[PDB]
Symmetry: D3
Subunit: 144 residues, 6 copies
């Protein structure tokens, strides 16, 4: 399918990383689609960080306000981007360690399957096997 | 308030950092709002740098020409972004080390205060105390 | 001259670098103008990579499909950017090591010359001199 | 004072960030002093990640086996570094938003105070004030 | 087991990525165990690159002279690191797309299997299937 | 030749780039051989910076105390590295834009010449020509 997404950016040369991990969780809590950090270099020998937020266009006011309230930035910049998304569906698969949800993504003539992280990570911690072991066991089980 | 900003980008896989520090100062001298470096990885095992310039839209021709004249790039790409900016005002505050300008930023119902860097850095160098000491003394003094 | 370019982006927190070097060569093989990697930091302590592709706007469907087929991403985002490009021409120059193609770039009143990489690299490997030696010999020879 | 710390490194070009965020939690849980990710660029156009682990030098075997079991790497490299650490103790300080434990670090004639994050984050989420507001409120409060 | 590897580093702020990709190929050709690029930020607003070379400690002179001849740097620094490497051997495994050599690495009681990239890339380009498809097909196949 | 250099490192997740650019100027002023910033990713979703300082090994105390006084870090780690440095001397060379001091570096049978930046930058700003133009003009001029 197709949709649109707002991208909000901010350059922070006077902001600590501690506060940035806080703002990333606030934004995700607020419903941002995605949030990420880009290492950038700014004037006067400043190692800096660019904060990027992807979100719903109707959420523009909320995520702007969070950024302006929680970080040191005086302004933000935003742009709308177009999107092309694959259609999702999930299969639950039985492994020696429990059920594992596999996300099957399709688009036109593409079909691919991603074992979900939280499932694999929870079971590996429960039976103390490596995360790759649960992952591989999920692939093996989705063979049928 | 609200405004618009042009963003100009360039990928440089055949450009030294020495020349890049020169171009960043030329652009800031020319009135760029902001200029930053993003580390990027390009084809044929090239560690590269993306040069981003933010500027006034009527300055598009100048900053383009600077980039094309001073760097190795054959083309630049540019886009206009929308902005949401907080309203600024400054308070000058008295510290045991001298006056320090505090930038108070407001937007709707947000109010935050940033001690200015050059003020704090100049006074710390003058009295050889750590930059954090002048910073904290500025916060303390803006308490009233 | 002037033209427009599509920019396609994708954030990959569940993708290996091996597969990324493969997708970068597939995209360049498919006619992408440029492809690059940006190191980014995503949620849940994930060091991640942003994949950026620049391309012809009529190639949007191909490069999207490559990204969605070959990487783990569920969606891509794209935007059109405007371009300002210099006019190219090439001079072939004679060096003690052979002919070397120099790319001369002009725009309005700017004129700059870039010795081409593959030429210099091939000759340096053939006569085992440093790449800088062939480069400098090319500049010296384009003096006339 | 003087002390030592083991540094373990591993270059991972075939490892997802998802798995990397997982192994970072395993390593801290395993008693690593610190763990961090450095973006690096490896052969064959691979965007990659360097994993660095700091720990007690007697933990070489523990943290070695953890890295070899949970990540994809064939080998790790390790070296001992000397350390100089400040003395810590904590003060509870009264702020307009509540008490905050401030961390006081000393070394010879150096003394600096860092308000603790979790306290500040705790008060900020409880009173819907910005994290920067409480942090600064603590700094000002720690003046006496 | 236990072993040692020489690490050579050099900070390059006046070196293009083009030349860096070239020297990376020279170094691997010269018998370096590994080579990678780290983005770093140096004085005077310079976006720069750290070159790290791993090699046999008896190669100090070879790889030193290579770095000093082919790059722009005035000096390099080097240190010996200890290593812990897993035992490798290769299995050919039958997949729906063909045979794939899988790399089996062992250390004490740890055993993990990584399908090889070039085989997977070879089958993927031949049958126009995604690299992730063959890799997963190998993982599932290597279960027995 | 052979020599040694002290390397001091510190991981800073609660430190602004503003303060980092400041401490970089303090460190160079304090006689550090070199200082650079590496973007790193630390626990709890923190975009962070690694500070590396190179110096004389007898400066351990000077540069240690500087880092502990001016930055936020609780500890630093340090190690001695061996060095191999080329011999420098400077030539003044005649270019169409003026005389430029070129730096000639030697080691055994290796000889390379790097025109100096500040001279090139000086002539470029004076005659409004590109820095790449003067640099290349120097390279060509240094052929004899």
């Amino acid at each position: 399918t197709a949709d649109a997404v707002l991208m909000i950016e901010a350059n922070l040369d006077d902001q600590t990383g501690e506060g940035l991990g806080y703002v990333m969780n606030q934004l995700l809590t607020a419903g941002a689609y995605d949030v990420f950090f880009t290492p950038i270099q700014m004037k006067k020998d400043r190692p800096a960080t660019k904060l990027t937020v992807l979100g719903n266009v109707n959420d523009k006011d909320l995520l702007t306000k969070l950024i302006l309230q929680e970080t040191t930035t005086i302004g933000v910049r935003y742009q709308t981007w177009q999107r092309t998304i694959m259609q999702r569906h999930f299969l639950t698969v039985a492994t020696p360690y429990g059920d594992v949800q596999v996300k099957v993504a399709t688009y036109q003539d593409i079909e691919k399957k991603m074992p979900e992280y939280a499932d694999c990570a929870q079971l590996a911690q429960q039976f103390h096997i490596p995360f790759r072991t649960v992952y591989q066991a999920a692939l093996v089980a989705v063979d049928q």
